[PDB]
Curated annotation (Swiss-Prot), chains A, B:
The organism's place on the tree of life at top rank: Viruses
Entry-linked CDD domains: UDG_F1_VAVC_D4-like (cd19372)
GO biological process terms, semicolon-separated: DNA repair
Location of the active site: 71 (proton acceptor)
Organism annotation: Vaccinia virus (strain Ankara)
Chemical reaction(s) catalysed: Hydrolyzes single-stranded DNA or mismatched double-stranded DNA and polynucleotides, releasing free uracil
Alphabetized UniProt keyword annotations: DNA damage, DNA repair, DNA-binding, Hydrolase
UniProt-recorded name of the protein: Uracil-DNA glycosylase
Gene name of the record: OPG116
EC class name: hydrolase
Family: Belongs to the uracil-DNA glycosylase (UDG) superfamily. UNG family.
Subunit structure: Homodimer. Interacts with protein OPG148. Component of the Uracil-DNA glycosylase(UDG)-OPG148-polymerase complex; OPG148 and UDG form a heterodimeric processivity factor that associates with OPG71 to form the processive polymerase holoenzyme.
Functional note: Plays an essential role in viral replication as a component of the DNA polymerase processivity factor. Excises uracil residues from the DNA which can arise as a result of misincorporation of dUMP residues by DNA polymerase or due to deamination of cytosine.
A molecular function GO annotation: DNA binding
EC number assigned by the record: 3.2.2.27
């Protein structure tokens, strides 16, 4: 569209297009990515390099919640965090169930966090070696820090998913269970519910979690 | 007592005694404080140098909430954050009122966060030039970071008081209004209430806020 820009990097995907809201961090991102990309690309990745940076197409100014996982699905990442086109990945399924139990919406065939007003779904690390979670942590390090720090300047609540997974200006942060953690249904459910209360506290409009449903 | 240690610093207060729980950070603290203390001491301070570090006598392992202000009272700091022996400072008075409105406890003559099980009250900066808030920020910088980072390794919830005041491993953090902020009574009240819910989420025992009352 007519509200975006792009930068050139020396390695695949060679071009990153991004929303104006990301501009402040883009030249630092280019530097860091040229330093590490040769080492990232040696492996088949989730997602493919062409989809590493597609979430930078998302605007930040209209966002108030960030739902953040550690890295993309071991396989089948689309570049949109949590996205599972054919609704097969356990993570998004469990998230959908919580929102079902919270909202009362019974029947659905999918769920996607990328279509909820005021929500940016996010992967801390933007890739992993195909089949291996956290396997690209070292490469993403400085970029992961830069991008999250930028996000927290816009959103009012950061919700990170996975306690042991997640081992400058403080924002309201919640660290809850991994979406696929066993026998922690109450805590997973309640964790989502709290977000809207915290937003009320910060004088922000609630999130309509039901917007994520696909029928 | 028989569960504590001490270190020698080159400037006033010359000796810091501390609980075993603080040990990991103490030699880094000594280094930083000898680098900056000459510049801190040129001014009359709140609290007096003898009371800068008295909160390091507090154990951390039994704590699950940190209630954290930016720095000590402009005047009359005792070394215990939020402490006001004669119950005169607006900050602790407003905190007491919230807990009154939350709990239903009507009659009291004081309130102190330092006597509540599972709560560590905390000043981010450990001093200020007498009469000037944030006036010692530059001196405390690296120590302030070190000590808070250590605290968040023990507590499950960090509650920071003052949005514009507060401009490695993520813990559950709430940033609420300054205790003395005008016409924000609901948000101040509700902010405290949320802490116990978050603790429930993290499978921790609630805080008994009424323990802070003095009759």
């Amino acid at each position: 569209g007519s509200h975006m820009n792009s930068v050139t990097v020396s390695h695949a995907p060679y071009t990153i297009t991004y929303h104006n809201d990301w501009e402040p961090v883009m030249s630092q991102l280019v530097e860091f990515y040229n330093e590490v990309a040769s080492w990232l690309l040696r492996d088949e990745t989730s997602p493919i390099p062409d989809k590493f940076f597609i979430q930078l197409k998302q605007p930040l100014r209209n966002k108030r919640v960030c739902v953040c996982g550690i890295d993309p699905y071991p396989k089948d990442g689309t570049g949109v965090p949590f996205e599972s086109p054919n609704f097969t990945k356990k993570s998004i399924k469990e998230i959908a169930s919580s929102i079902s139990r919270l909202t009362g919406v019974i029947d659905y065939k999918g769920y996607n966090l990328n279509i909820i007003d005021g929500v940016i779904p996010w992967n801390y690390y933007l890739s992993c070696k195909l089949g291996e979670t956290k396997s690209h942590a070292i490469y993403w390090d400085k970029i992961s820090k830069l991008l999250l720090q930028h996000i927290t300047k816009h959103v009012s609540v950061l919700y990170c998913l996975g306690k042991t997974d997640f081992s400058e200006s403080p924002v309201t942060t919640i660290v809850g269970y991994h979406p696929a953690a066993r026998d922690r249904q109450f805590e997973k459910d309640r964790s989502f519910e709290i977000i809207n209360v915290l937003l009320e506290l910060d004088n922000k409009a609630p999130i309509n979690w039901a917007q994520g449903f696909i029928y």
